[PDB]
């Protein structure tokens, strides 16, 4: 679990969005596994606007942060799950690192701010949904 709080927006994995997220919907994209909802309180986070390919992510299944080198945002095949049919997920970045079900929502950060959130996993792999192109989160 996990979310980004920036301005009057809350960014979460679309597959983990609550009834309240959907009732205050701003934007969602099933192909990116992202959903943004509106908040009444001002958030705590800054979004990175950069091309970093190294950073640190929080891994809830280890209660620890790990450094990673990650690929550029791209269209990657993701196998069927309880939440989605088999499909290509866009704006996804992969890295070698630990992840397991329960870890989605963990934040990936570089020196400039928040880069994205955990969205997929593999055997010794972790995938992150990029948010750096969503310039409207800043306004
Ligand atoms: C960290 S999540 C995770 N981790 C692992 C496995 C599986 C998962 N789960 C997923 O990848 N998804 C399920 C939820 C929707 C995700 C999506 N973006 O389409 C896909 C298997 C075994 C190794 C670890
Ligand atoms: Zn950066």
Curated annotation (Swiss-Prot):
It comes from the Viruses. Zn(2+) 1 binds at residues 50, 52, 110, 112. It catalyses: Selective cleavage of Tyr-|-Gly bond in the picornavirus polyprotein. The active site is at 15 (for protease 2a activity), 33 (for protease 2a activity), 104 (for protease 2a activity). Disulfide bonds: none annotated. Homodimer. Cysteine protease that cleaves viral polyprotein and specific host proteins. It is responsible for the autocatalytic cleavage between the P1 and P2 regions, which is the first cleavage occurring in the polyprotein. Also cleaves the host translation initiation factor EIF4G1, in order to shut down the capped cellular mRNA translation. Inhibits the host nucleus-cytoplasm protein and RNA trafficking by cleaving host members of the nuclear pores. Counteracts stress granule formation probably by antagonizing its assembly or promoting its dissassembly. This is Protease 2A. It comes from Coxsackievirus A16 (strain G-10). The chain holds residues 869 to 1007 of 2193 of the full protein.
